[PDB]
């Protein structure tokens, strides 16, 4: 979620790296909108999205998923999501 | 060791989502064996491919 | 036999790794006296033939060049061939091999060659040693080659008539242009290189003319050949065009799908997207 | 098929001789002679465990 | 693992290969970083070891170099080392390969030429190749070698008083003196190199101040160090490996069998040492 806060869940799966499918995909892939390289090395990227035209959120991806040149910088984002990423990456 | 062991060997097979890494390792093994039979680093019919059977019933 | 100027080139060094690329050009026979490897290395150009058309099988096709300058290149970068006044700045002389520099000096026919290098070598162990022999020997071979290229005198190879022309009409028609002055200042060797490379946009047959391009490809400056045209932006430069790897392709559902967009197009002839050097004017007479 | 192989000419190798010797030394102690028979027995067991 | 700076040297092309490589000591740890091969090649010196009685045959030892300059040559030909003031004048850098000239510009802090040639190379194909990272690896190596504090570790120690003066002991050898002031202004890498090379005439110890040769070998020089005997004729430096005179008006010398008679007697070696000034060491 971009901003909103979850409610009503009763159980959670802990993150594990294996969840992040590196889709081999087609050689050419074209993408649009804001893009933030999570890791060039692991081909990880984050992209803006909204559900129902009204539900701002960010989408993780891992794979070819080539895109416009207009690489955006982590600096710009909200501390909220930034903290969220900082943990969830679990570089630890 | 060159092959980007992001994981311990066993983890690879404990995963089943991948086929990529598995087929790569297998092909490399076959290459090494053939090389030990043949002191001549080489390549073959340059098309080959693989399947992971995943059921006992297969 | 070898005929590339650069097959002559060897120098004293610890090196036992001389990188001489000299192509089949050396044993071909067209008086370029320079292999395409160096046409590339120093001069960023490619040798071509105009298939001069004839109804007769005697097509009598003609030598040509095309340059490789990238569209993004500017100024000196677009300068193909400097004048004596500019080459020394244009090229990283000292980075270039010593004898190569000296050879360039002599091609420019500067006394400064002997003024500087022939003295400077004195201290060197190689100057002390027999290698002086080999050095001056290759020098003398080069001098001989230059004398063979020499047109200047009747007691020389070149003689009699000339009918090529340059400095062709500018669209904005700025008066004249010293291009023949530059031509004459350039060694007849360089002039022969120009003759080898530069198509005229018109050939006047004796009593007839044919024209082959709308407009000139190249332009000339007192400082050197300019890979540029009077007008607009530079044309799009035709861009320059085994171990194990991790990236191994995924399966796809074993389909070729639409061949058409490549099939019929490849059936259609694909353009020779190159930059042939047209600059100047030619005439013929009985 | 579950994959493609590019399947062109490819072979990997490495040459860090010192590195490899470091490996060898780390490996030195093990009485593999002993240790691998049980592995072969593992494969054996699996040969019949293959089927019930 | 290998450390000689001249083994770190690389050539931009396969030809002009940096062959005739470092002496095998490049695998050693010495803090010269020059191999002895290169030290012979460039500056007419060869390194050496003083055996010091550790109050005993016990291990105390110090490094030395002999110079290899001859007795006849003068001025520049006697020069051992330059300053940045004159390093180009001595090296004739243009004769040298571009990475060599680069590294000299490093030692002498000619950042102007360094950045100039770097910017020129940027777009060259061979510098899009990792030659940049190679050169900056050399940079990092020097950076470590001066990460040991260039002033504090080298000389501005907290045992500050354990100082070397290279000034001439002789009060009449007055061309020295401010040479020690110059020493501070030489780059610290070179200061350390000298601190290696140069034997003191004297050392203060809490045990004793002690004296090791009667008179100084050379003097500090106003651009870089030179075969610089404080006075008199240059001492005969022999040479151990063109239509000129080579007269040697030898004594007739008919006393044959000399060596077979005398060889047991001490065959005094001759190569010039490097005594200079006063070290101080606590206890
Ligand atoms: Zn050639
Ligand atoms: Zn060395």
Residue A24 distance to chain C (closest CA, Å):
6
Burial A44-71 (b: 16+ CB within 10 A, else e): bbbbeeeeeeeeeebeebbbbbebeeee
| Residue C3, SS3 per DSSP | coil
- In sign, the C-alpha dihedral spanning E4, E8, E14, E18 is negative
d(CA E149, CA E157): 9
Token pair 């003024």 in the structure block, residue: C115
Instruction: Give the pair of three-digit tokens for residue C181.
Output: 């002055």
Tell me the backbone φ, ψ of residue C145, rounded to 5 degrees. -60, -45
CA atoms in the 13 A half-sphere facing the CB of C196? 19
Distance from CA of C136 to the nearest CA of E (A): 19
Cβ atoms of residues A64 and A29 within 8 Å: yes
CB atoms within 10 A of CB C35: 25
Encode E147-183: b = buried (16+ Cβ within 10 Å), e = exposed: eeebeeeebeeeeeeebbbbbbbeeeeeebeebbebb
Distance from CA of C257 to the nearest CA of B (A): 20
Which of A21, A24, A25, A66 is the best substitution to test chain C (most C C-beta atoms within 10 A)? A24
List, in order, residues 6 or more apart from E186 with CB less than 8 Å away: E83, E194
Which contacts qualify for C29-33: CB closer than 8 Å, 24 or more apart? C29/C3, C30/C63, C30/C196, C31/C3, C31/C192, C31/C196, C32/C193, C32/C196, C33/C3, C33/C4, C33/C5, C33/C145, C33/C149, C33/C189
Any D CB within 8 A of C251 CB: yes
Q: What phi, psi does E49 have (nearest 5°)?
A: -130, 125
Ion ligand 2 contact residues with beta carbon within 5 A: E 4, 6, 22, 35, 38
Query: For this experimental structure, what is the resolution in angstroms?
Result: 4.8
CB E81 within 8 A of CB E190: yes
What's the A10 CA to ligand 1 centre distance in angstroms? 78
A22 interface with C at CB cutoff 8 Å: no
CB-closest option in C248, C250, C251 to B24: C248
Contacts of C244 in chain D (CB under 8 A): 10-12
Tell me if D8 and B43 make a contact (CB, 8 A cut-off).
yes
What value, to the nearest 5°, has the Cα angle with vertex E4 and ends E2 and E8? 85
Q: What is the distance between the alpha carbons of residues C44 and C37, in angstroms, rounded to a whole number?
A: 9
Q: What's the E129 CA to ligand 2 centre distance in angstroms?
A: 24
* E-contacting residues in C 66-95 (Cβ below 8 Å): 92, 94-95
Chain C contact present for B17, CB below 8 A:
no
Q: Does C248 touch chain B (CB under 8 A)?
A: yes
Tell me if chain C has a CB within 8 Å of the CB of A24. yes
E106 is written with which tokens?
């490093």
Residues 93-152 on C with a CB inside 8 Å of E are 94-95, 124, 128
The reply to whether residue C15 touches residue E20, judged by beta carbons under 8 angstroms, is no
What subunits make at least 3 CB pairs under 8 angstroms with B? A, C, D
User: Which stretch of DSSP H or E encloses residue B33?
Assistant: helix B20-37
The tokens for C27 are: 């044993």
Determine the residue of chain C that is closest to D3 in CA distance.
C251
* Residues in chain A within 8 Å Cβ distance of C250: 24-25
CA distance from start to end of chain C: 36
Q: Where are the alpha helices (DSSP H) in chain E?
A: 5-8, 36-43, 87-91, 98-107, 111-122, 125-126, 132-147, 179-185, 188-197, 258-262
Interface membership of D50 toward B (CB under 8 Å): no
Contact state of E14 with C14 under an 8 Å Cβ cutoff: no
Specify the 3-state DSSP secondary structure of E212.
coil
C51's CB contacts (< 8 A; 6+ apart) are: C59, C61
Cβ-contact E176, E253 below 8 angstroms: no
Residue of chain C whose Cα is closest to the Cα of E93: C94
Under a CB-based contact definition with an 8 Å cutoff, are residues E188 and E146 in contact? yes
Contacts of C220 (CB under 8 A, 6+ apart): C166, C167, C177, C179, C182, C226, C279
- Residue E75 tokens, joined: 């001025």
- Tokens for C198? 């530069």
Q: Smallest Cα–Cα separation from E40: which of E67, E71, E60, E2?
A: E67
Cα separations (Å) of C254 from A23, A63, C250, D4, E232? 18, 22, 11, 10, 94
Task: Give me the torsion for CA of E123, E125, E128, E133, rounded to 10°.
Answer: -110
Among candidates D5, D9, D11 on the partner chain, residue whose Cβ is nearest the Cβ of C248: D5
**What is the CA(E32)–ligand 2 centre distance, in A?**
10
Largest CA distance in chain E: 72
Tell me the residues of chain B between 8 and 27 that have a Cβ less than 8 Å away from chain D: 19-20, 23, 27
**Number of residues that this document lists for chain B:** 58
Q: What's the alpha-carbon Rg for chain E, to the nearest Å?
A: 22
The SS3 assignment for E61 reads strand
Residues in chain C within 8 Å Cβ distance of A25: 250
Which one of B17, B24, B29, B43 would you mutate to disrupt binding with C, by most C Cβ within 10 Å of its Cβ?
B24
For residue C282, which of C186, C215, C174, C210 has the smallest C-alpha distance? C210
B16 vs chain A: nearest CA distance in angstroms? 10
Tokens read off for C16: 């036992």
The Cα of B50 is separated from the nearest Cα of chain C by a number of Å equal to 10
Total count of residues recorded for chain C: 286
Q: Do D11 and B43 touch (CB under 8 A)?
A: yes
Q: Is C250 part of the contact surface with chain A (CB cutoff 8 Å)?
A: yes
- Percent of chain B that is helix, strand, coil (3-state, to 5): 40, 0, 60
- Residues on chain B touching D8 (C-beta within 8 angstroms): 43, 46
Method: cryo-EM
């Amino acid at each position: 979620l971009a901003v909103n806060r979850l409610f009503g869940a009763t159980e959670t799966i802990d993150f594990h790296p294996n969840l992040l499918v590196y889709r081999q995909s087609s050689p050419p892939v074209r993408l649009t909108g804001d893009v933030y390289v999570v890791d060039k090395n692991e081909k990880v990227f984050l992209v803006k999205h909204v559900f129902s035209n009204t539900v701002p959120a960010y989408l993780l991806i891992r794979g070819d998923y080539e895109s416009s040149s207009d690489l955006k910088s982590l600096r710009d984002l909200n501390p909220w999501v930034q903290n969220t990423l900082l943990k969830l990456l679990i570089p630890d | 060791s060159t092959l980007e062991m992001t994981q311990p060997l066993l983890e690879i097979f404990r995963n089943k989502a991948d086929t990529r890494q598995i087929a790569a390792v297998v092909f490399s093994t076959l290459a090494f064996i053939h090389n030990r039979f043949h002191p001549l680093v080489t390549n073959f019919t340059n098309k080959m491919e693989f399947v992971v059977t995943e059921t006992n019933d297969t | 036999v070898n005929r590339c100027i650069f097959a002559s080139i060897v120098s004293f060094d610890a090196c036992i790794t001389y990188k001489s690329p000299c192509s089949p050009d050396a044993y071909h026979d067209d008086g370029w006296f320079i292999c395409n490897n160096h046409l590339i290395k120093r001069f960023k150009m490619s040798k071509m033939v105009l298939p001069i058309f004839d109804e007769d099988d005697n097509q009598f096709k003609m030598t040509i060049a095309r340059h490789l300058v990238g569209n993004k290149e500017r100024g000196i970068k677009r300068i193909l061939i400097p004048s004596a006044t500019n080459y020394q700045d244009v090229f990283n002389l000292n980075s270039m091999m010593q004898a190569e520099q000296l050879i360039f000096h002599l091609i420019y026919n500067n006394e400064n060659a002997v003024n500087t290098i022939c003295d400077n070598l004195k201290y060197t162990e190689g100057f002390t040693s027999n290698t002086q022999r080999v050095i001056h020997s290759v020098y003398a071979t080069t001098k001989s080659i230059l004398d063979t290229t020499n047109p200047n005198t009747f007691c020389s190879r070149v003689s009699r008539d000339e009918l090529r022309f340059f400095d062709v009409t500018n669209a904005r028609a700025l008066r004249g242009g010293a291009g023949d002055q530059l031509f004459n200042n350039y060694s007849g060797f360089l002039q022969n290189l120009i003759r080898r490379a530069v198509a005229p946009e018109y050939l006047q047959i004796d009593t007839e003319e044919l024209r082959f391009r709308n407009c000139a490809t190249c332009i000339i400056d007192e400082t050197g050949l300019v890979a540029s045209v009077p007008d607009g932006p530079e044309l799009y430069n035709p861009i320059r065009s085994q171990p194990n790897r991790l990236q191994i392709r995924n399966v796809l559902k074993f389909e070729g799908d639409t061949r058409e967009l490549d099939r019929t197009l490849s059936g259609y002839e694909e353009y020779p997207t190159y930059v042939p050097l047209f600059l100047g004017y030619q005439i013929i007479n009985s | 098929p579950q994959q493609y192989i590019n399947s062109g000419t490819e072979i990997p190798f490495c040459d860090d001789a010192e590195f490899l010797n470091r490996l060898l030394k780390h490996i030195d102690p093990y009485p593999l002679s002993r240790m691998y028979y049980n592995a072969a027995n593992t494969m054996f067991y699996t040969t019949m465990e293959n089927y019930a």
